[PDB]
Structure formats: structure tokens, C-alpha cells
Amino acid sequence: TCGLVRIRLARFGRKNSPVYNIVVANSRKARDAKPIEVLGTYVPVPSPVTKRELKRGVVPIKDVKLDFDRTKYWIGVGAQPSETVTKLLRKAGILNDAWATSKNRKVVFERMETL
Amino acid sequence: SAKAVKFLKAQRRKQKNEAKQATLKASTDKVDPVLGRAD
RNA sequence: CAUAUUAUUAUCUUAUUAUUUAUAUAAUAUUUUUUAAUAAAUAUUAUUAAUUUAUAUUUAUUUAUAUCAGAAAUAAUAUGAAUUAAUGCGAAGUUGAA
RNA sequence: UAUGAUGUUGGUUCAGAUUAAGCGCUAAAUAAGGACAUGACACAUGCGAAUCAUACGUUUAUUAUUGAGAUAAUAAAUAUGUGGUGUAAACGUGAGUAAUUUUAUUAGGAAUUAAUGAACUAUAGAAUAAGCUAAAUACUUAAUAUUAUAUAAAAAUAAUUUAUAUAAUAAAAAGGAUAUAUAUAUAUAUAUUUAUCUAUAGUCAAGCCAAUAAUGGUUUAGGUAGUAGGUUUAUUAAGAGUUAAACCUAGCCAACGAUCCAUAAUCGAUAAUGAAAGUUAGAACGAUCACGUUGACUCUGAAAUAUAGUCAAUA
Ligand SMILES: [Mg+2]
Ligand SMILES: [Mg+2]
Ligand SMILES: [Mg+2]
Ligand SMILES: [Mg+2]
Ligand SMILES: [Mg+2]
Ligand SMILES: [Mg+2]
Ligand SMILES: [Mg+2]
Ligand SMILES: [Mg+2]
Ligand SMILES: [Mg+2]
Ligand SMILES: [Mg+2]
Ligand SMILES: [Mg+2]
Ligand SMILES: [Mg+2]
Ligand SMILES: [Mg+2]
Ligand SMILES: [Mg+2]
Ligand SMILES: [Mg+2]
Ligand SMILES: [Mg+2]
């Protein structure tokens, strides 16, 4: 994270049940103040799955809603995503491995796009 | 005292303007609305 | 009659600051005229530190204007007041006959 | 609820919902949402802004070469020395403020806002010399790198824009960390890293003005002399009596309420209520402004009368 424009997560919800708002915001402004744009939402809690479903083969899913075309516009301009936003966008395929870090093998499931 | 001289200048200007307004009230040739001009 | 706070000013005082005047054997840099100490070579010749000198950058001193804030005067905004005006209520009644 | 009874006018009260709530009595567990509205009254105590050793310096220990030290390699220590970045935000508050710069709205404007980037993006380039610091990426001095003219062209024209050619733009910088390669510990030369400076554009941002609305008292009725307007000058990136100077004109506001006084931060896709128009609040969520004990000024900076600095006031 650096620069004036940053793509971050703003905390919404209630105590002990966070949800997050993927926003484009000024660095110098407050975390929960109204941002430049609201690119999406991110619900951190995985969807619970039945013990049976663990055996069947499905995994918990985390729900992210995002504007793919607009996030490309903001990344192009030089808005600097944060570490968590970097992780989210990199899984989405928006960001490639150039954004990986040393701190961060096999692929059970490759990324797939569907309607 | 520059304040005193400035105040005197302001006063002179103001009284000049009030005299101008008072004499401008009677500067207009006021005909008789009843009887028209004198002749 | 007494206390309090904002506001202003042809008044008094003024921190600091901003411009603005003038003065510096006043400084610092460079430019001259010069004086000492030091080096190299066969009388020196240049070098540093000081002497005078005239351009900048400031310091001290002053001239003027404005200026925080203080008084003094006025006004208001309030707060209290002996003295004092009116009226409201109620107790059972008292007096007139409007 | 009048009335001896009737009809009507007329007030008073009640039924409903709510709260930034308080109090009386009473009270089990859990989940969530809030919590000094009053004295912007005063404050004990502890915390809330640090970080960088890969900027410069210091200080050790071992090994090697040199002879008390000197120089390298490797380990460390050093944020009480010199430096870089950060505190214009966020947090809290609602004193001031009735608009002279505040709030809300507009598919609103120009002066037709700067050779401003503040901190990232994409591109090119450059990174020189001295001095002073003990040394430097600290400071100074110096080197090199849009606007105004003149010619035309047009039209979105009685100006702007375009292109050209000149003038000045002309304004900078900084190295550290590793490796290696040369040669003669000394320099030097490349590469990798992380910095530095300039330029174009993008993004994020700023400054200014307009129109409409924004509480009560006229038992506050006249107010205003920079006052209202014009012309110049200084200042600003930029208009304007905004501030300072000069000279002209006599205007401007006002019974559809000026000026003055009192009170108040303002608002919403927020909260309460109603059938609705509306009315109330502005706690909580969010937006804007103001302030950080009080007043004025100054430096830096693009942006500050800064929670900075100076001066004064209070304690
Ligand atoms: Mg009765
Ligand atoms: Mg709770
Ligand atoms: Mg309070
Ligand atoms: Mg070191
Ligand atoms: Mg230090
Ligand atoms: Mg602030
Ligand atoms: Mg530098
Ligand atoms: Mg005026
Ligand atoms: Mg108030
Ligand atoms: Mg109100
Ligand atoms: Mg307030
Ligand atoms: Mg609120
Ligand atoms: Mg509160
Ligand atoms: Mg302030
Ligand atoms: Mg306090
Ligand atoms: Mg203050």
C-alpha cells in the first residue's frame, strides 16, 4: 500500500460478524468514511457445509461480489491494492503472479469462468 | 494622527454626498400635476 | 444606585509583525589601494591573517502607517437591588342597589 | 366536560406512537445497537507517534596483513551526535457562526485558475563541479536539461484556437547495498537492487464566483460613508472596495422587513411522527464546516493566521 489512491477493505456489519466492502479510497482518509468508489463486497466467513458434503467433495465457498471491468480501470490508473485485496484479486485472475510476495504447490482446482 | 485625518476626509466626503442628494431632490423641475406648466 | 461581558473609537499606551524612511570608522562575503608572517628558487615573487576601499545579504539604531492586548469614554447585552406601579387567586364575610 | 333540557361556537383534557431520556418499584440468561445533551469548567496518574543501522557518523570482538595503532573480511552494539520520512490526517468537540468566506441543490459558471504534485501509474532522459559540516542522500554557490512577441491559417470569431519562428523557458538531482571485471589497499567499469532529479499525460486533488432556500423580535424604522458604482496601481495562480494607495460619480439596502438584538453548528437515501402535505431531532450511521485554553501575526508549504513558531492573555 502506497500512494494517494488505494483499493482497500472497509469494515461493515456488526460486532463479531464482519463483512467487508472493497472500495477505492484516499489513503489519508478514514477507513470507514465514504470512498471514491465501491467496487464490491467480500463476506469473509466461509459458507458452512454439511459433514456429508465434506465426503461428497465440495468445499466451503467465500462470497465476493466485484465489478471486474471497473477494477481493471482502477488498477490501470495506478490505484495500489492492499495485501488482502491483492490476495482476492490474484485469486480472481485479475492480477497475475507479478503481485506475489516471498512470504506467500499443486492445483486441485484450476480457476474457471462460467455463466 | 492618520486615523483623525482619514476620519475628517470621510466626514467631508459624506456631508458632500448628503448635500448633493438634498439638492438633487429639488434639482428636478417639478411641474404642477394639476395645472401643468406655469405658462 | 451596584456588578459583569462583548462592540466601537478624531483619545492614551503598545508586544510582535508587515511594509516604509533615514544612519552606521557595524558586521559577513566578494573588488580595489595596501601592511605584517610564511614559503620556493636566484632583488624577490607570490601566498594566508590583518589595513583602506564599493556591490550584495543581514544586524543595531531610528522616521512614518497598521497591529494582539490594556486602559478612558459611550452604547448595548445580561445579572441583583432599597423605593415603587398594576393586576391574579382564594377564606368566610362586610357594604352599596349599578 | 356547556345547559333545567336542546342546537351551535369555544377552549381544557383524554385515547395513539416515540425518546439521546430521568426517577419510583422490580428484575433471569443470551445476541445485537448506544452511552456527560449540562461547565468549549478545571485536571492527579499511565498511555495515544514513531521509524530507518542499506544516509552520515560513532563503539566493540575475532581473523589476516602490517607496528600504541592503521587497513580490510566477518560478526555485532549505537536513534543521548548530524540526517530522511510521518503528526494539513485521524480522534474529539459544537464554542464561534443567521452568512463577509457557513450548509443544501444545479446535467451552473470563469478570471476563460499557476511553466504547483502533494504520491502512485505509464513512458523517456539525466544524475556535473566546488565549498561548509567531523562526514553525507544535511546545507549553501555554480554548471547542463510554459508564457510573451511576430507571421500566417481558420471559425465554435467581432475573440479564441491552430501551426510556425524567435525570446527568455532554464527550473534540477544523491547516493547506499551487493556481486563481479580490470588493472595499479587504490581507484576505475559493468550488471542486480533500492533510492534521487527533470518532462508529457492519467488518477487523486485544490482555490474563486453565481442562482434558490436556511429561527424570533420592527415594542429594532430608517440603515450605510469603503458606504454603492466607475477608473488605474500594488498583491494573488486567479475575479472582486478583499486588502493598501490615488482620482471620479452619488449612489446601494429597506414595511414581500433593512439595520440592530437574541438564539443556533448545517444537512441526508439518518431518527420520530402523520393518511399525506408537513412537523421535530441533528444522540447514533453518513456528508460539510468550525475549533483543539483565548487573540493577533510569521515560516514552511500547492494548500495553514496550523493542536507548528513568536508575542501577549488566563491557570
Ligand atoms: Mg358542570
Ligand atoms: Mg454491548
Ligand atoms: Mg459536551
Ligand atoms: Mg552504520
Ligand atoms: Mg538523532
Ligand atoms: Mg486538522
Ligand atoms: Mg537533496
Ligand atoms: Mg467592504
Ligand atoms: Mg452555539
Ligand atoms: Mg435548528
Ligand atoms: Mg456550534
Ligand atoms: Mg451525528
Ligand atoms: Mg456522544
Ligand atoms: Mg485552529
Ligand atoms: Mg481543555
Ligand atoms: Mg485559537
Side-chain angles (χ1 to χ4, degrees):
Chain A
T1 61
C2 53
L4 302 179
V5 189
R6 311 200 178 160
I7 307 173
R8 303 181 299 177
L9 291 163
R11 195 211 183 286
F12 277 81
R14 283 180 220 82
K15 284 202 211 57
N16 280 313
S17 67
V19 305
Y20 289 111
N21 189 359
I22 302 98
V23 298
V24 184
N26 285 355
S27 66
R28 195 100 86 190
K29 279 210 308 206
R31 188 196 63 209
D32 288 342
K34 192 175 77 172
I36 301 146
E37 288 215 79
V38 178
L39 295 179
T41 61
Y42 164 43
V43 184
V45 181
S47 85
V49 288
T50 301
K51 285 272 180 293
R52 193 145 280 194
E53 278 159 296
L54 277 296
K55 326 165 193 172
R56 291 182 180 181
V58 70
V59 298
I61 297 169
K62 306 167 84 80
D63 270 323
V64 192
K65 287 193 240 183
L66 189 80
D67 195 22
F68 294 85
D69 192 27
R70 174 69 75 142
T71 315
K72 286 165 172 149
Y73 164 57
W74 285 112
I75 295 293
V77 175
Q80 295 298 109
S82 180
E83 299 176 9
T84 318
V85 192
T86 295
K87 171 202 197 56
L88 292 192
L89 298 173
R90 204 161 60 110
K91 296 287 177 67
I94 296 285
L95 296 190
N96 57 9
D97 269 22
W99 271 269
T101 315
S102 70
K103 292 181 181 179
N104 291 95
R105 304 300 94 190
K106 73 162 151 183
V107 183
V108 187
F109 192 110
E110 282 274 30
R111 168 200 320 134
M112 91 186 196
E113 296 104 347
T114 68
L115 271 74
Chain B
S1 308
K3 291 188 39 155
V5 191
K6 186 183 286 294
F7 172 59
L8 286 169
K9 186 175 182 291
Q11 183 94 350
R12 285 171 276 155
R13 201 209 204 160
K14 188 191 148 148
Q15 311 185 304
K16 183 185 282 189
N17 195 71
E18 311 153 334
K20 175 90 54 171
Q21 292 289 132
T23 301
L24 216 59
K25 285 193 287 181
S27 291
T28 64
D29 302 67
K30 321 173 294 178
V31 304
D32 190 342
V34 177
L35 289 176
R37 284 199 210 297
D39 58 356

